[model samples]
Target: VNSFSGYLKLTDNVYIKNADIVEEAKKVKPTVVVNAANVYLKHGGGVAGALNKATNNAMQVESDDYIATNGPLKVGGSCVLSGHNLAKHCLHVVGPNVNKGEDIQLLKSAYENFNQHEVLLAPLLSAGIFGADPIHSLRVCVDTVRTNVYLAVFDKNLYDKLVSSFL
Candidate 1:
């Protein structure tokens, strides 16, 4: 079993909790799980893949159709989709890939979008494979959310990095 504890505070009708997003996403109704996906919104690997699995691939089909009909889910931008059997919605944000020379501004833009919804379960944006510094990205994430947020941290390195900054 996973335990969620208050790790931070946000103004408005929201707070931050550290827990497992995939499990939460499986049951959360009004709140959303923010999935950081590639620029193409490919639901292949990482947390994104697991989220796709949680939604039983319905999200990927929607993601694919959304792009084919409209345009790319560009870096820093996000779109909402039904979480099928799990969460009520999934906010898919395309984060910057720093290895490709993507700028921090894009990462900031991505985090800034957190205000679009009231409740969220978000990981440190771009702090993993995308390579954004966990410290800076954590700052960007915490600085932007308006209401309730549940930050689902899966990496020990990331957890240590963020926690160490407070002590």
Candidate 2:
């Protein structure tokens, strides 16, 4: 079992906990799991893929239909769909192409949309494949939220990065 790397009291209502994303999501059973998906809502890999599995592909169909009807989402935009497995909702945020790290602001905007939920589980947005510094993205996720936040870190590198980023 994975243990939390750290915790922070961002506000009276908002707190951040670092642990395994899927595991923590199951434990917390949050109202929403915010997915950092592309405009097309393709949950084929990374955290999005993991979330897709957890929900038994229920979120995928909703996301696909939403995209099919409305077209690709704008960067920093999001859509909410019913969660299937452990959560009550899934907030799909359209992430920016940050493979070069030039669009950190847009990535932060994606995290900002998570603030409206009462309880949320989210990974460091725009980090891995997008190439933004995970630390910075994690900070933005923590800084922007108003409700209780459960931050799911899936690896040792991300756990260490999050620790040093705070220090």
Candidate 3:
């Protein structure tokens, strides 16, 4: 059981967890969860893919027309999608482009643009598909996102790495 999930506090309220993202989502029951999206609003992989599947692909449909007409979502821009599973809503935001190097400004802006909520769950954006260092991504999220941010993951090693770096 202990190997299954563990947690660490990154701040007075913020937490980093080595557990199933969806499991933590159910536990927190946040009003909003953040999705790492691209400018085109494609949710084919990573957190976006999981979210899309969890929401029965409704979010993709909801965001398609808007994205087609509006062009690629700006790196710092965000929009809301109706939620399912453990949350009442989802905030989709374009993340940093690691290929262009670490863009803390983009991360900060995206986090800043998210809707205010009592609780918000997010993954380490840009750390996966965007090929960024998780620590840096986590740090930017900690600084900019004005909410109780719970960084959830299913991999123990990733969770441990974050916890060690946090201290």
Candidate 4:
């Protein structure tokens, strides 16, 4: 389970398999908590489980969660564009060479997912002139999701790189 999904489970107070682990037991408090680890596999637990196992395979049940991909979601295609293969349903926000004020329409389209019942997951890639600006990125993604945490596959280095820059 990635930290983002783990948090969503905890938000609903779902007790994952491992509870005796001193570290995780201590940190499972509040409405939300941040865990930045990349690989969620445990020592000898489920062979391929984390403290939060429910979220690790939650994506398998496509009926519950909704995936979203925001393509050029910001005005003027100001945000970066990247491809993702980790979601069930993704909403891509594609637009022509948009700039600044030109993104409101796209922004509204991206915001529409927030009203849905499933979890809308978006992997935003920032590159070149579009995603280079920080303030614009924050405005689009900061508080949009019910649970937004940095997603890490198996590569800790890549995960850390993503979290350090984006999260």
- Model 2, position 69: C-alpha lDDT score: 91
Residue-level lDDT tens digits of model 1 in 1-167: 12335555443433444555687666555357788887787889777887788777988998899888877777888888776665677888877888778877887788777888866777778867777787777677766666566777777566766766732
Better of 1 and 3 by TM-score: 1
For model 1, name the residue pairs that clash: 14-147, 14-148, 15-148
TM-score order, best first, reads 1, 3, 2, 4
The digit string of per-residue lDDT tens for model 2 on 1-167 reads 12333565545544455566666767666778778788888898878888888778877888888878999877888888876776777788876767644466787678778777766777777877767777777667667766666667677766766766673
Query: Candidates' TM-scores?
Result: 0.84, 0.83, 0.83, 0.30
Q: What is the lDDT of candidate 4?
A: 0.28
Q: What is every candidate's alpha-carbon RMSD to the true fold?
A: 3.4, 3.7, 4.0, 13.6
Candidate 4 scores a C-alpha RMSD against the true structure in Å of: 13.6
Task: List runs of model 1 lying over 4 Å from the truth.
Answer: 1-18
Which ranges in model 2 have alpha carbons more than 4 Å from their true place?
1-18, 100-102
Task: State the local distance difference test value for candidate 1.
Answer: 0.72
Residue range 11-93, candidate 3, lDDT tens digits:
76566777666666666667777788888888898888877877688778877976777767787777777766757887787
lDDT of 2 at 144: 74
Best by lDDT: 3
